[PDB]
Design an enzyme around this catalytic site. Structure first.
Site, mmCIF file in Angstrom:
data_model
loop_
_atom_site.group_PDB
_atom_site.id
_atom_site.type_symbol
_atom_site.label_atom_id
_atom_site.label_comp_id
_atom_site.label_asym_id
_atom_site.label_seq_id
_atom_site.Cartn_x
_atom_site.Cartn_y
_atom_site.Cartn_z
ATOM 1 N N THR A 122 0.827 -1.200 0.000
ATOM 2 C CA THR A 122 0.000 0.000 0.000
ATOM 3 C C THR A 122 0.865 1.255 0.000
ATOM 4 O OG1 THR A 122 -1.833 -1.083 1.173
ATOM 5 C CG2 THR A 122 -1.746 1.323 1.231
ATOM 6 N N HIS A 163 -7.126 -11.532 -0.127
ATOM 7 C CA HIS A 163 -6.507 -11.019 1.090
ATOM 8 C C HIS A 163 -7.317 -11.397 2.324
ATOM 9 C CE1 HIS A 163 -4.076 -8.947 3.793
ATOM 10 N NE2 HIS A 163 -4.196 -7.696 3.384
ATOM 11 N N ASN A 204 -3.827 -9.975 7.900
ATOM 12 C CA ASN A 204 -3.600 -8.646 8.469
ATOM 13 C C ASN A 204 -4.828 -7.970 9.083
ATOM 14 O OD1 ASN A 204 -0.848 -8.833 7.821
ATOM 15 N ND2 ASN A 204 -1.171 -7.919 5.796
ATOM 16 N N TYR A 261 -8.152 -7.966 8.420
ATOM 17 C CA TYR A 261 -9.241 -7.413 7.624
ATOM 18 C C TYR A 261 -10.440 -8.360 7.644
ATOM 19 C CZ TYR A 261 -5.573 -4.239 6.130
ATOM 20 O OH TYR A 261 -4.546 -3.323 6.107
ATOM 21 N N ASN A 314 -4.095 -4.987 13.447
ATOM 22 C CA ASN A 314 -5.528 -4.694 13.481
ATOM 23 C C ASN A 314 -6.275 -5.518 14.527
ATOM 24 O OD1 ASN A 314 -5.214 -2.760 11.455
ATOM 25 N ND2 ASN A 314 -5.680 -4.219 9.814
HETATM 26 C C1 LIG Z 1 4.184 0.103 3.373
HETATM 27 C C2 LIG Z 1 3.647 -1.298 3.383
HETATM 28 C C3 LIG Z 1 2.408 -1.570 2.816
HETATM 29 C C4 LIG Z 1 1.906 -2.867 2.822
HETATM 30 N N1 LIG Z 1 0.674 -3.129 2.258
HETATM 31 C C5 LIG Z 1 0.173 -4.414 2.262
HETATM 32 C C6 LIG Z 1 -1.066 -4.678 1.693
HETATM 33 O O1 LIG Z 1 -1.720 -3.768 1.185
HETATM 34 N N2 LIG Z 1 -1.564 -5.964 1.698
HETATM 35 C C7 LIG Z 1 -0.833 -6.987 2.269
HETATM 36 O O2 LIG Z 1 -1.281 -8.131 2.271
HETATM 37 N N3 LIG Z 1 0.400 -6.729 2.834
HETATM 38 C C8 LIG Z 1 0.907 -5.445 2.835
HETATM 39 N N4 LIG Z 1 2.141 -5.188 3.397
HETATM 40 C C9 LIG Z 1 2.926 -6.308 4.017
HETATM 41 C C10 LIG Z 1 3.878 -6.930 2.999
HETATM 42 O O3 LIG Z 1 3.193 -7.896 2.234
HETATM 43 C C11 LIG Z 1 5.060 -7.580 3.706
HETATM 44 O O4 LIG Z 1 4.593 -8.570 4.595
HETATM 45 C C12 LIG Z 1 5.841 -6.522 4.477
HETATM 46 O O5 LIG Z 1 6.353 -5.572 3.569
HETATM 47 C C13 LIG Z 1 6.993 -7.107 5.284
HETATM 48 O O6 LIG Z 1 7.980 -7.622 4.420
HETATM 49 P P1 LIG Z 1 9.532 -7.283 4.688
HETATM 50 O O7 LIG Z 1 9.738 -7.135 6.177
HETATM 51 O O8 LIG Z 1 10.398 -8.409 4.174
HETATM 52 O O9 LIG Z 1 9.897 -5.999 3.984
HETATM 53 C C14 LIG Z 1 2.642 -3.897 3.396
HETATM 54 C C15 LIG Z 1 3.881 -3.621 3.963
HETATM 55 C C16 LIG Z 1 4.386 -2.326 3.957
HETATM 56 C C17 LIG Z 1 5.725 -2.044 4.571
#
Ligand SMILES: Cc1cc2nc3c(=O)[nH]c(=O)nc-3n(C[C@H](O)[C@H](O)[C@H](O)COP(=O)(O)O)c2cc1C
EC number: 1.6.99.1
Length: 383
Positions: free
Chosen positions: A129, A283, A286, A288, A343
């Site tokens: 996101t 999805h 997280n 939702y 959440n």
């Molecule tokens: C800024 C941001 C936005 C994210 N948006 C979503 C999302 O919209 N849907 C989702 O399932 N996960 C989302 N995530 C989680 C990512 O899928 C992933 O689990 C997260 O980036 C952690 O990975 P990393 O620690 O290896 O970078 C988001 C993570 C970040 C940092």
């Protein structure tokens, strides 16, 4: 004191692990030994559009900025440089104390097939996101999004899972999040899908329904319901106050509304594939709506969609079955977060969570044996 390895003992298909893998390549090297395991990189794929090439040869990566994540700007979005571009800009450094490793010899860069796509490498781009969608209308950014997705489709055969796209205004709540229901969104989405396709990469769409995580005022503004699994449990004090302040209380979903949500899921999927998407991801993680139905802390329903492990998973599996019967099982994936407490979820605190998600993976694998196996299963690592 937690692990998602149990899924491997139940689900026999492709598993996409995500979370804290970028700065830990010694862990990834161990985790890629399993031939059906793919790795997703969140933050450093935002920070690095050429992260794959930096993971293959063991290159140093760029620092990610926490303030440019959910902010509307071209800065910290499409201005991140490639390795060569980072070299031409001088230094006075990148990341701090970090030792990179070359995973080009590992299983990460040997080809694999997920769904109808032929991945040349197993590095996956998880849903992210960015909050840069045009408001109002929930339109993806016309100035930045195309370039943004084009930059990260640099490596030929790169699997890309898009940000959470609202299947419906009812599934909305965020004004800066893109949609999928309307044609006006579908034009831009078509442009993005084409932009990714021209780079010989693949694009997957995450179907998003906020649930209680939505902003009650934003929904009351458009005459929409603020809904969840149960109406006696809430997220926090803020979400509790915003509901009564905006005269929009937390609504408990009935059967008809659930069927409506499912219909909207189907329409969202078919619209997605009509725009030229490779497939969709459900999805259910997280914290939702679907996850809200899964989690016992959020689901206190006594009816068909609650009261037990079989009942709490009925919604997710309903959506799965619907989408499979709609666009095909090869274009459908699932997103789960067993140990996620985001959440207001249970996570490791609830001793029955592992049983719940094991039931989920069990039903999934049972449908897989029937001849209808999902393309993949997306897992969020405990942290
Ligand atoms: C800024 C941001 C936005 C994210 N948006 C979503 C999302 O919209 N849907 C989702 O399932 N996960 C989302 N995530 C989680 C990512 O899928 C992933 O689990 C997260 O980036 C952690 O990975 P990393 O620690 O290896 O970078 C988001 C993570 C970040 C940092």
């Amino acid at each position: 004191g937690g692990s998602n390895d149990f899924v491997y003992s139940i689900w026999k298909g492709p598993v996409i692990r995500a979370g804290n893998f970028a700065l830990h390549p010694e862990v990834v090297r161990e985790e890629v030994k399993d031939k059906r395991t793919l790795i997703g990189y969140g933050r450093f794929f935002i920070s690095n559009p050429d992260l794959v090439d930096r993971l293959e040869k063991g290159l140093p990566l760029n620092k990610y900025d926490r303030d440019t994540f959910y902010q509307m700007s071209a800065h910290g979005y499409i201005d991140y440089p490639t390795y060569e571009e980072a070299l031409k800009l001088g230094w006075s450094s990148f990341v701090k104390d970090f030792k990179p490793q070359a995973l080009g010899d590992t299983n990460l860069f040997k080809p694999i097939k997920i769904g109808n796509n032929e991945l040349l490498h197993r590095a996956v781009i998880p849903p992210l996101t960015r909050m840069r969608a045009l408001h109002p209308g929930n339109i993806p950014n016309r100035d930045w999004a195309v370039e943004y997705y084009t930059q990260r489709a640099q490596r030929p055969g790169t699997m890309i899972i898009t940000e959470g796209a609202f299947i419906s205004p009812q599934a909305g709540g965020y004004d800066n999040a893109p949609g999928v229901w309307s044609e006006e969104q579908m034009v831009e989405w078509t442009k993005i899908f084409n932009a990714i396709h021209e780079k010989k990469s693949f694009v997957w769409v995450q179907l998003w329904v906020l649930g209680w995580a939505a902003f009650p005022d934003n929904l009351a503004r458009d005459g929409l319901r603020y809904d969840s699994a149960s109406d006696n449990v809430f997220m926090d004090a803020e979400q509790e106050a915003k509901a009564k302040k905006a005269n929009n209380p937390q609504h408990s979903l009935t059967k008809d509304e659930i069927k409506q949500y499912i219909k909207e899921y189907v329409q969202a999927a078919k619209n997605s594939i009509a725009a030229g998407a490779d497939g969709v991801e459900i999805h259910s993680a997280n914290g939702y709506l679907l996850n809200q139905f899964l989690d016992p802390h959020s689901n206190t329903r006594t009816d068909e969609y609650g009261g037990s492990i079989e009942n709490r998973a009925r919604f997710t599996l309903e959506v799965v079955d619907a989408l499979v019967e709609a666009i095909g099982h090869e274009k459908v994936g699932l997103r789960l977060s067993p140990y996620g407490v985001f959440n207001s979820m249970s996570g490791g605190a609830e001793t029955g969570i592992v049983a719940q998600y094991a039931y989920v993976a069990g039903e999934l694998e049972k449908r897989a044996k029937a001849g209808k196996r999902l393309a993949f299963v997306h897992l969020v690592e405990p942290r």
